[PDB]
Structures are given as structure tokens and as C-alpha cells.
């Protein structure tokens, strides 16, 4: 929307290391960013592209979930929502949901019902304190879905790490409940957490994301992949992320 709404220019006040992951990206274009807690360092593939801001799509469901927990729209005893009897093109959406099943299947209507109960001024205050991207709420409808709110790949990692790791006004039980909804994989070596995002413009993929974190036995890593062209789906951003983390030794 404005002059600064499409890019992130704040200098990194950290150690960073430039990566080359162009062979894993193949014919897709985009960026990859990772932060290590122990090193307090960032690791960036395609730094310029990583500072370009795009709609977060379904990765913003992370944040609506946190806001929903914070304002007690949902909680740990009950985060169930009944289906409002509208047919969707996948049967996983056509039933009752709780936070876990809604996050796993990316059920838009669950999160829209959360957003509807959230006053605009609280959201504005949260995006400001979080430094969430361009902070542009626009029409305040489904503003995170190919619309006014945009955020860069680098910011997705900075903002998620700071939400989760700083002692802020969000509680530890809300963070833990959000974590459970995001858990994808656990073995003896790691826990992998994350959320896909996929934008569709005129029947085509235009925006792919996978944003998450890994807990290993020595460290904890926040990461995000954005895909801007090629086949830029959430699913593809997830495959690329896991390929990349594997090579770096994060997944063993």
C-alpha cells in the first residue's frame, strides 16, 4: 500500500551467514532464513529476497491462535468450535474443530471466527509490539489472506522467535498450547513445529510459506522458507525447508 509496505529495511544487529541453497530451490525462487538460539546468529539464503514483504496467508493463523488464547476466545480445557453447516471442498473442514485440527488442516473458518471477536485496536497494538511486517490492517476483514498485511521472510523468523522467547504479556500456557497445535514431527533427535501458507491468484500458486521451529537436544532453531515463483505452494516450501534443515544437521 505505502512506500515501505513491500519491503523490510531494518539492519540486522546480529551475526549472519549467507548460504547457498539454490540447488535445493531448483526452479523455484524465494528465500530461506534460520536463527539459532545458541549461536544468536542468522543464516540466510537470498538476503534481498528475504526482505521482500508478502502476505503471510495461513502462517498468520499462528498469531490469530495466540491472540485467541490471549483474549480467552479459546483455552486449554475447550478450544472446540462447532461447524456452522456450510459445505467446503474438503470434508476435514466440514465438522467441528479444536485448535489442533484447525491448525493442522488450515481451517479458515475457525480462524475467521476468532478474528471476528478481536477488536481492531488490540490487533494494532499487538502488531506494533511484535513488529509484525507492514502492520497494515486495511479493511480489517481477512486482512492476512492475500490482502493488506505483508511480512518478509526474515521478519517471519525474527517476529516468531521474539514472540515465543521474550518474557512478554503472552503466557507460557498460551505458548505451550500454540506449540502443541504446531507439532509436526518428533523422534529421538528432534521436534519440528510449523505452519504452511499458500496464496492462490487466478487459479495459480503465487505465494508459498512454511514457518516454524526445531527443538533438538543441543539447540532450538526458528526458520522460514518463502517461495515467490516456480511452484510457490506451502507444501513445496515445507519440502524445501526440511531438505535444507536436514543438510545443515538440524534434523539428527
Amino acid at each position: 500500500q505505502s512506500i515501505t509496505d513491500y519491503n523490510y529495511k531494518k539492519p540486522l544487529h546480529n551475526d549472519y551467514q549467507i548460504l547457498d541453497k539454490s540447488k535445493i530451490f531448483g526452479s523455484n525462487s524465494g528465500s530461506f532464513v534460520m536463527y539459532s538460539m545458541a549461536a544468536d546468529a542468522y543464516y540466510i539464503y537470498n538476503e534481498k529476497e528475504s526482505r521482500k514483504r508478502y502476505s503471510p496467508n495461513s502462517t498468520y493463523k499462528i498469531y490469530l491462535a495466540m491472540f485467541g488464547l490471549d483474549r480467552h476466545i479459546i483455552n486449554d480445557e475447550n478450544s472446540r468450535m462447532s461447524w456452522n453447516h456450510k459445505h467446503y471442498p474438503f470434508d476435514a473442514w466440514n465438522k467441528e474443530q479444536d485448535l489442533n485440527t484447525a491448525m493442522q488442516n488450515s481451517v479458515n473458518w475457525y480462524f475467521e471466527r476468532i478474528s471476528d471477536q478481536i477488536p481492531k485496536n488490540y490487533t494494532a497494538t499487538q502488531l506494533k509490539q511484535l513488529n509484525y511486517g507492514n502492520k497494515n490492517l486495511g479493511s480489517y476483514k481477512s486482512y492476512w489472506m492475500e490482502d493488506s498485511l505483508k511480512i518478509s521472510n526474515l521478519e517471519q523468523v525474527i517476529v516468531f522467535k521474539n514472540m515465543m522467547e521474550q518474557n512478554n504479556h503472552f503466557s507460557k500456557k498460551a505458548k505451550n498450547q500454540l506449540s502443541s497445535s504446531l507439532l509436526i514431527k518428533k523422534n529421538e533427535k528432534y521436534e519440528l513445529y510449523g505452519k504452511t501458507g499458500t496464496g492462490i491468484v487466478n487459479g495459480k500458486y503465487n505465494n508459498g510459506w512454511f514457518v516454524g521451529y526445531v527443538i533438538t537436544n543441543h539447540d532450538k532453531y526458528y526458520f522460514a522458507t518463502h517461495l515467490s515463483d516456480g511452484k510457490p505452494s506451502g507444501k513445496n516450501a515445507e519440502l524445501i525447508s526440511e531438505k535444507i534443515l536436514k543438510e545443515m544437521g538440524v534434523l539428527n
Side-chain angles (χ1 to χ4, degrees):
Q1 204 257 330
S2 174
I3 245 79
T4 47
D5 280 348
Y6 287 92
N7 53 291
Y8 172 61
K9 57 199 215 337
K10 190 181 211 187
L12 217 47
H13 295 121
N14 292 263
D15 288 328
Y16 68 99
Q17 157 174 339
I18 297 303
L19 301 174
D20 190 352
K21 294 306 165 179
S22 67
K23 278 172 33 261
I24 283 168
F25 273 66
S27 43
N28 313 281
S29 326
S31 48
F32 166 86
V33 177
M34 185 180 76
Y35 171 77
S36 152
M37 296 295 297
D40 177 40
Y42 291 86
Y43 301 83
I44 307 172
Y45 170 61
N46 270 347
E47 205 261 6
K48 177 205 164 57
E49 181 59 36
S50 87
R51 294 178 159 270
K52 265 171 182 158
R53 295 185 160 147
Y54 301 99
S55 179
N57 290 299
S58 292
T59 68
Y60 192 75
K61 293 164 172 151
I62 289 163
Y63 292 91
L64 287 172
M66 180 67 98
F67 299 158
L69 290 161
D70 189 50
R71 300 189 56 77
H72 304 288
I73 300 168
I74 50 170
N75 73 358
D76 36 59
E77 192 69 25
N78 176 32
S79 75
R80 295 179 331 258
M81 275 189 203
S82 60
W83 175 48
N84 69 294
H85 284 265
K86 176 197 170 103
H87 176 84
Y88 293 102
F90 337 89
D91 278 357
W93 282 35
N94 293 327
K95 50 179 76 152
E96 185 175 75
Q97 311 284 328
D98 61 19
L99 182 57
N100 302 329
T101 69
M103 190 71 76
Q104 200 194 359
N105 295 303
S106 209
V107 189
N108 291 346
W109 67 253
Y110 180 98
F111 292 96
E112 287 159 353
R113 197 171 310 157
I114 290 188
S115 190
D116 290 341
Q117 295 180 71
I118 297 170
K120 191 196 196 197
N121 85 115
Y122 165 95
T123 306
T125 300
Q126 293 316 306
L127 297 203
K128 174 177 187 166
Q129 284 169 8
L130 297 173
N131 299 325
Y132 193 99
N134 61 14
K135 305 174 282 179
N136 190 338
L137 300 177
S139 299
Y140 199 63
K141 248 80 163 144
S142 266
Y143 53 86
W144 61 95
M145 296 300 273
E146 301 300 316
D147 197 58
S148 64
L149 181 61
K150 309 172 193 284
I151 185 170
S152 72
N153 198 24
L154 185 49
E155 285 170 294
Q156 288 260 42
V157 176
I158 295 171
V159 174
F160 199 18
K161 185 264 299 180
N162 285 335
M163 184 167 76
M164 298 299 275
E165 306 295 327
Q166 297 169 342
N167 293 328
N168 33 24
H169 99 282
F170 298 118
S171 65
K172 170 53 66 186
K173 76 178 166 150
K175 300 181 189 196
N176 292 353
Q177 185 169 5
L178 175 79
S179 287
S180 310
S181 73
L182 295 173
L183 181 68
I184 292 174
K185 204 158 158 61
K186 177 180 176 65
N187 62 19
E188 341 163 280
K189 300 317 175 212
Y190 69 91
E191 299 177 351
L192 188 260
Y193 298 82
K195 184 65 183 85
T196 55
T198 306
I200 288 172
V201 173
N202 288 311
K204 282 216 180 79
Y205 294 133
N206 205 58
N207 199 1
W209 284 111
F210 184 59
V211 173
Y213 68 101
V214 181
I215 299 173
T216 68
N217 278 312
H218 305 297
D219 205 356
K220 177 179 207 185
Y221 301 88
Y222 286 76
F223 65 88
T225 294
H226 180 259
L227 293 185
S228 55
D229 195 15
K231 192 190 214 181
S233 69
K235 182 195 174 243
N236 223 22
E238 181 168 8
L239 289 158
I240 286 163
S241 297
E242 282 146 7
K243 259 129 103 219
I244 290 180
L245 292 166
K246 189 154 175 237
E247 268 196 12
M248 296 181 81
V250 169
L251 307 179
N252 26 236

